[PDB]
């Protein structure tokens, strides 16, 4: 009795809610280039804070996805449009000795170029995956997407790379960071910590596996949704990073055509010809697969585990896809996913790989991009961190897992699992035995 109402401000109590998060860019770079300012995020471990997490449900993954789209749109906006290049192609492609690999070879056509009364013959090379065959004589070809979308050449001076990004909440909202070392994507976290901003997440763009990300604290971690076994994607996150290396040993020649926007095409190739390929530490790879199999048969009690390469679908999912700088790759990944199971740099694997220029935009089709050729020979090196698997149902008595993960949002889904955002509720009340004085 006599417990008079009292009020308290600055209260530590919060709730879940969506909000618009700040991005943050590096101090050096090539909206994004100079801003927002590079932070110095701190972090406290909180004593007894118990919070639940859900890496499938949280909103900010969608915001990452939208921001990536918007930034790509802004970067691509001032670049040239390749619409006048849509003319009929009359090409036979038998000049160089190693003809069959590319089969677009000085590939001829007409362009309007300097004077609009004039029309001039030109030619350049193309990889046949960027080409479709018209009816009648095979010499008649067309650009692949030109009957369905408008193609923009990438701005060569604005080459973009997986620059790390830190995400910062606004005032009144705090980002909760689970420090648990064996978090499965759902359930309580007893090791809650808070920060101004997230660490520097990179916008990696790849399929069937991811190339640049973080690593797990424990052993290889399995994360999947648990509403039903009939899942879309299963995320496997490596603790032991494994190196992968790739090469494009042939030397390219850049050539230019002006519309006065400078269109770039592929000139004559220099040096003897090889098919672009990759390399993998052979023992390390299927040591890691053995670890992943041992982890994976924990969930599934008493059934075999086996891998096969993906079947059907576009080139973006039938092959591992990634990019060394300003070139794009599609590596025929049959050998890597052919083990089977039941209830340290020797013997290096190599795998064949193809490259193509005209890329349907990753998140969604209907808008087309053209990457100008990169001169000379190219290699890039990365160290993978996880796999994107999907389970083939139906087959009784035998599980089967195959490389999928073509949907671009899953890459950032597998990396933003750390965090959650909460609205602060600074105002609260309580009973107490003291009242105002008149």
């Amino acid at each position: 009795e006599n417990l008079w109402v009292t009020v308290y401000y600055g209260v530590p109590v919060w709730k879940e809610a969506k909000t618009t998060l700040f991005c943050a860019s590096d101090a050096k770079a090539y909206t994004h280039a100079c801003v927002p300012t590079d932070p110095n995020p701190q972090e406290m471990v909180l004593k007894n804070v118990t919070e639940n997490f859900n890496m499938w449900k949280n909103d900010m993954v969608d915001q990452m996805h939208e921001d990536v789209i918007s930034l790509w749109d802004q970067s691509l906006k001032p670049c040239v449009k390749l619409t006048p290049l849509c003319v009929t192609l009359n090409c036979t492609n038998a000049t160089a000795s190693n003809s069959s690999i590319i089969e677009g070879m000085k590939c001829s056509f007409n362009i309007t170029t300097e004077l609009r009364d004039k029309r001039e013959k030109k030619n350049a090379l193309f990889y046949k995956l960027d080409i479709v065959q018209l009816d009648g004589n095979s010499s008649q070809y067309r650009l692949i997407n030109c009957n369905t979308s408008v193609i923009t050449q990438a701005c060569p001076k604005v080459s973009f790379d997986p620059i790390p990004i830190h995400y910062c909440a606004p005032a009144g909202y705090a980002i909760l960071k689970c420090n648990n070392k064996t978090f499965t994507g759902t359930g309580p976290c007893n090791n809650v910590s808070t920060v101004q901003c997230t660490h520097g997440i990179k916008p990696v763009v790849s399929t069937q596996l991811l190339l640049n990300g973080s690593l797990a604290e424990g052993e290889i971690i399995i994360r999947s949704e648990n509403i039903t076994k009939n899942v879309k994607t299963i995320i496997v996150h490596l603790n032991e990073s494994v190196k992968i290396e790739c090469t494009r040993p042939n030397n390219k020649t850049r050539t230019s055509i002006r519309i006065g926007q400078w269109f770039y095409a592929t000139g004559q190739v220099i040096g003897d010809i090889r098919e672009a390929y990759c390399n993998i530490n052979e023992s390390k790879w299927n040591e890691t697969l053995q670890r992943v199999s041992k982890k994976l048969k924990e969930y599934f009690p008493h059934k075999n585990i086996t891998f096969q390469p993906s079947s059907g679908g576009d080139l973006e999912i039938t092959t591992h896809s990634f990019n060394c700088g300003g070139e794009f790759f599609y590596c025929n990944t049959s050998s890597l996913f052919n083990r089977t199971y039941m209830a340290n740099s020797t013997r290096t694997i190599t795998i064949h790989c193809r490259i193509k220029q005209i890329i349907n935009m990753w998140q969604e089709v209907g808008r087309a991009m053209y990457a100008p050729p990169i001169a000379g020979n190219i290699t890039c090196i990365s160290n993978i961190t996880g796999l994107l698997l999907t389970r083939d149902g139906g087959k009784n008595n035998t599980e089967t897992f195959r490389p999928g993960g073509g949907n671009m949002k899953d890459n950032w889904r597998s990396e933003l699992y750390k965090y959650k955002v909460v609205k602060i509720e600074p105002l609260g009340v309580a009973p107490t035995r003291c009242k105002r004085r008149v």
């Epitope: 509403i227 009939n230 879309k232 079947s311 679908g313 999907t390 999928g404």
Partner: nanobody
């Protein structure tokens, strides 16, 4: 509002190969998995497989993985199914059906063809 029309079918000769199709009315082509389910006469339904329209990934029932094939043409919002070497028992009715998918799971069918 959403419609899933179908074409093809009729009589098919024994041992032949046949092609169905479904035209997706405008809801959003890339957001919903599509399943191909059938019904033999005097029997309950059963599933053949599902195709993700976005990336074109198929997946089949274990008893028909040699004979089936799915693929799509995203521009036309159109789907296709190829079944090879029809046998007698495959005399049946074949349906397209939209699937309601969450961010990480597939749940059920809402609109049939």
């Amino acid at each position: 509002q959403v419609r899933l029309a179908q074409y093809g079918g009729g009589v098919k000769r024994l041992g032949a190969t046949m092609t169905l199709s479904c035209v997706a009315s405008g809801y959003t082509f890339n957001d919903y998995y599509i399943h191909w389910v059938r019904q033999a006469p005097g029997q309950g339904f059963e599933l053949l497989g599902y195709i993700d329209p976005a990336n074109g990934r198929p997946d089949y029932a274990g008893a028909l993985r040699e004979r089936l094939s799915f693929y799509r043409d995203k521009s036309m919002e159109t789907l296709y199914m190829d079944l090879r070497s029809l046998r007698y028992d495959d005399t049946a009715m074949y349906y397209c059906v939209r699937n309601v998918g969450t961010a990480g799971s597939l749940l059920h069918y809402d609109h049939w063809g």
